[PDB]
Amino acid sequence: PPTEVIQLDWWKNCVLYQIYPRSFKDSDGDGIGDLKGIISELKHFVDAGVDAIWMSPIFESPMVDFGYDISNFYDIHYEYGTMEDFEELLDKAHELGLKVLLDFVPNHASNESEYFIKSEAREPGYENFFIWADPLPNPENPGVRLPPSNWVSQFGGSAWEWSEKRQQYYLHQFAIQQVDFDFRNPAVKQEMFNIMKFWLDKGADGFRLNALPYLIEADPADHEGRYPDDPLSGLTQFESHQLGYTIPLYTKDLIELYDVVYEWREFLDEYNKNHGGDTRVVFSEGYANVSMTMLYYGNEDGAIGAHFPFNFDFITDLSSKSNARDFVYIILRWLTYMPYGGIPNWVFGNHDNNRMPTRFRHDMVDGLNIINMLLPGVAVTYQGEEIGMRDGYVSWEDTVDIEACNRGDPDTYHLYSRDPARTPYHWDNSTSAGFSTSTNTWLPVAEDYQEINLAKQKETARSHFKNYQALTKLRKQATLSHGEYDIRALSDRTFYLVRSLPTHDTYVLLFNVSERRDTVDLGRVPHLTLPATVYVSSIHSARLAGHEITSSQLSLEAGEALVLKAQPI
Amino acid sequence: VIQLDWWKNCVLYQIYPRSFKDSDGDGIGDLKGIISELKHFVDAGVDAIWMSPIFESPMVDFGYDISNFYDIHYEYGTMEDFEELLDKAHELGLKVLLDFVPNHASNESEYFIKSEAREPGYENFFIWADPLPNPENPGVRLPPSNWVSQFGGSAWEWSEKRQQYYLHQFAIQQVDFDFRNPAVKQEMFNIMKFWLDKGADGFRLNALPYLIEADPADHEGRYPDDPLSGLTQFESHQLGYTIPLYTKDLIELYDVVYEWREFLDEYNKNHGGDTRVVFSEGYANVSMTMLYYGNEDGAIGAHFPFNFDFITDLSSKSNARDFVYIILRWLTYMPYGGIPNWVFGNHDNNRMPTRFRHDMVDGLNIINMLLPGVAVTYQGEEIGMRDGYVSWEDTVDIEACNRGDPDTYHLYSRDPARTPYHWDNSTSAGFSTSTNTWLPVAEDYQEINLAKQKETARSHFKNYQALTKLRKQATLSHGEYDIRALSDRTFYLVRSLPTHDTYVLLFNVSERRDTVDLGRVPHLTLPATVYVSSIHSARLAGHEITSSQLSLEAGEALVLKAQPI
Ligand SMILES: OC[C@H]1O[C@@](CO)(O[C@H]2O[C@H](CO)[C@@H](O)[C@H](O)[C@H]2O)[C@@H](O)[C@@H]1O
Ligand SMILES: OC[C@H]1O[C@@](CO)(O[C@H]2O[C@H](CO)[C@@H](O)[C@H](O)[C@H]2O)[C@@H](O)[C@@H]1O
C-alpha cells in the first residue's frame, strides 16, 4: 500500500508568491494598486494553489524607490491604504489558510524618516544611527572637498552625500534618499528587533530581508582612521560615477553582516518559542557568489541564519542562451553547495529583473513553472509568471525607476530600468487589463494583455494558469513533498527531473529547452516504467493531459515540456 | 560484465621525453632512456603512454616547433630507437601514442621555406597577409590585425623574403598552417598514416582550439580585429588584451577533427588489431570542449577531449563542495556514451602537489583512479613530484622568455613542471649520470624519488600501484558513482555495483580536522576495511573502520572496501 508520510512544516515546501502591490490590483481608480485590491483577490492565491504571499514594501514611503525608501517602518503607505486595511488583509488571508510575509528593509531609511531627521541634527540617541564621515583631508588643494572614499552607489554617483546642516557626508549605497544605518550601533540593531516584533505582533508570518550584502562596510578603525577606497575594476567602459568602476571589497559581503542575520534568527527562534502557532520565518535577499550566499543559512561553527537565502540562479546564470546541460548544472549548484538539512528554493523572477518568458522564450513558460514546482523545496512565483506575463514596453517618458533615471538616458535607460517587470497585472481583457477601471495607470499596461490575461486562461481549455494549478495541486502528493529527486541531461536539448518514492506514483519532467526538436530514449529515465500518462503538457504540446506514452522513443518540439505520471517504484 | 575496449578505462601516462631518462649523459632525456624504463609502466599499472613531441625540431618550444614531421629528433635518438621503443612497449602490453602538432610547423620546416619562397603548391600552406598603412608614422607598417600570440606580441611576423606577414598563434618560429587549404589537410592524413603504419596506437592532438581563424573573404578582404578585453592590466602586446573571437574555437575547426576520426575509423577497419585512438588537447569552455567528442547532428570526433578541470578550476583554494561541483561538470556535460577522463597535470602547468598541497597527493591520485573512465597521469604525479626551482638564468621556456622578465618570468614559466624525473638519490636523481641537466633537478630529490618510495612500507607510489590494481575490479570498470560533500572540508565518492564490493573515497581537502557521520554515505555499511590511506593517515591498509563518526586530519584520504550493495 502507499506509505503514510508526516506533513512538512509549512515553510519547507510552500509555494511562495511575490506580490508587487503597486501593480497587482487597483480598487479605487487612481492607477495605483492597493491593499483593498489585494484583499479583493486573496481568493486568487487559493485558486492558484499558493501557500504564502510576500508583499514588496507597503510602509510609509516618499516612493523615490517605490517603497524601499521607508519614512515610517510602523505604518502603511497612504496610496496602498491604512493599518486597518492591513489588519483586514492579514485576517482575511489567515482565514483562507494563507501565510503573509512583509518586505523588511533593514539596510537603509528614507531621508524623510524621523531616524534621519534626528541623526542629521545630532539628536542624542540618533547622531550615530547612520554612517557619517568627514571629507578626506586634501592638503594638496585645501579649498577642494573630497568624499571619504571612491565608493559608488548601486544607483550611480558617489555613495557619499554632503549634508550642509551636519557638515558631514552620509553613506547611501542606494539613492541619495536611502541612508545606510550603522549596523555597528547596538541602538540600530535593537530598532530592527523592535520593527520585526511590531509586525509579528500584528500577525505577520515572517519577512523577506532586503539587500543584506550591503549591511556593513569597512570600519575606518581598520584603515588608519579613513574609509578605504574600494579597489578599481580596471574596466575601460566605467568612469568613477558609474557602477562597475569599483570592486565592492569594503562595501559588500562583509563577514560581520552574517552575525546580524544569525542575531535576527536567534530573536525569531525566541519569538516562535514564546508565541507558538505556526513558525514565523525569514527569507534573505542577496545577490552574491555561492559561498557568500550559503553563509545566510548558517556556518560550519553551528550558526543558524535565514530559513533560506533566495536562489537567484534562474535569473543570474540561465537564460534563452542556456542548453539542457546548463539547466542541470545550475540546478546542481544549489543542491551541491547548500548545507546539510538546508531547504532548497527556486526563484524565476522578481520586481528587479526581466520577466521569466522575456529572459527565456514565450514557448518555455510551462517547462519553467514545472521546474519550479517539481524541484525539491520551495517554489517562488513572481506576480504574472502563473499566466506567462512578458516585460511591458516602457518609454523613457513613462520610466519612473530611480535606477534608470539615475544611471540612464533616452539611449541607455532600458539597460537599467526594472519598470518593464512592474507593469500592471493582466486580470482580463477589460480597460487596463482589469488592473484598474481607469486608462491612467502608474506604469503602462503591456500591449499584449488581450492575448495574455488570467480570465482568458481560466476560460480556454489549455493555459499557463491551468498548468500552474495542476502543478501546485501535484505538490500535495507525497512524491513531491517527500520523494527523491534525480536530474540529468538526455542531450544538449532535453533534460529529465524525476520525483520518486517507494509505493507512490513517479512523476517525470521532460523539457526540451532548445530551439530544435529532440528525440530521446525514455529507457534512460530512471524509475520511468511505460506505459505512462501525461499529467501536464505545455500549452502547444501534441500531447493532452491523459495522453498515454507507450513508445520508448519520444520526440519533443522546441520548448515542449511534459509531466508524466508512472506506476510506483 | 562485457570487457571494455582498452582506451575506455586505460591509465594513460604522459611522458615528457626530455626530462624522463637520459641514457647517454648529455643531461637530455632520450628514447633509449624511455626503453630502459618501460618496465616502470608495468610496475605502476599504466596501460598506455603518450610522449610529448619527439620529431625533428629546432627545440624553440622543445618539440612543438617541428621541422620534419616524419623523423626523430637527433638529441632523443633515431627512427631505429623509436621502432625498438614501440616493439618493447607492445611486448610489455603497453599502448603508445604520439604528440601530433597539426596547428603549426617550425619556420625551419621545408613546408615553410617552400611557402615563403612561393614554390608552387605551397604558396597557401600558411596564413600570408598584407600590411596595413600606419596612422601616426607612414613608414612603420601595421599588421593585418590586432591579434595577440599566446606567447606575447603580435600573432603576425613580417617575412623580408615574401614581403607579407605570416600568422603565428604560438612562437614567431611556429607558423600556422592554412586549414582551408585541402593540400594542408591531405598532409595531415599523410603524417598520421606514416606513424600509424610504424605501429603507433594513436595520437594526442595539440592546440586544436587554434586550428582556424576568420576568413578575410567574410570581412571584405581584411582580417577582423579581435574584440578588446578592456582590462587595464593588459597592454596591446600582452595575452589578455583581446578576446579571441576570430582566432580560437571557430566551429569549422571541429569539422577537421571529425574528418580525422573518419580517416582513423577507416584505418582501424582496414588494419584490425587494437583500436588506434585520438585524444584532443584544447583549453576552452565546457560547451566548446564537448564538441570535440562529436555533435548532436551525429558527427564523431576524438575518442575524448582531455578534461583539464583539476588544472583550471580546482586548487589549494578549493573546498569539498568545489571539488564535487567541478567533478560534476564533465559528468553533466559529456554526451551519452562518452568516456570521462581526468587530468591532474601536464608539461604546461604547475605540478599537482604545488597547485594543491603536498598532504593532498594521495587523495588526488585516488580521485583520478576511482572516478569513472580514464585516469591521466603526468610524469612525476605517481611519486608526488613538486615544481622544481628554476632561476631566470636557467629558464629556457620561450613562453617565460617572451612574456616575462627576471621579476615576472615565474608567472609564465612551464619549466618548474619539466625538471628531470626523480628515479633515485644518485647524481641528478638518477635521470642522468651527468650533473649538467637541460633543466636543474628539483632540490628535494633526496626526499622525493621512486627508489625511496619502492622501499618504504607506505608511499605515494605504493598507493598509486594499489589504485591502478583496484581499477581491474568490476566496481571501478562498470560500477555506478555517487559523489557529495559532507561538509566544506570533506567529500565522498562511492563506486557500487550489485554483488561486487563497494569502494568509498573519503577526502578531507581542507587544512583542518573534520569529523563526519559515515551514516550519511550511501551504500557504505560498517565494518569496512581501509584499502588505501594517505601516507600521513593514522589508518593503515587492513585497518577496520567500525564507528560511524570519522575524524579525518588535514588532507587525509581513505579508500574503504565495504560489502556489496
Ligand atoms: O537593482 C536593484 C539592486 O538592489 C537590490 C539589492 O539586493 O534589490 C533590492 O534592494 C533595493 C534597495 O532597497 C531595491 O531597489 C530593490 O527593489 C530590492 O529588491 C538588487 O536587486 C540590485 O542589486
Ligand atoms: O601555455 C601553452 C599554451 O599552448 C597550449 C595550447 O593547447 O599547449 C600546447 O600547445 C603549445 C604550442 O604547440 C605548446 O607550447 C604546449 O607545450 C602544448 O601542450 C596550452 O597549454 C596553452 O594555451
Ligand SMILES: [Ca+2]
Ligand atoms: Ca549598509
Ligand SMILES: [Ca+2]
Ligand atoms: Ca591556426
Ligand SMILES: [Mg+2]
Ligand atoms: Mg489604487
Ligand SMILES: [Mg+2]
Ligand atoms: Mg538591474
Ligand SMILES: [Mg+2]
Ligand atoms: Mg640523453
Ligand SMILES: [Mg+2]
Ligand atoms: Mg600557463
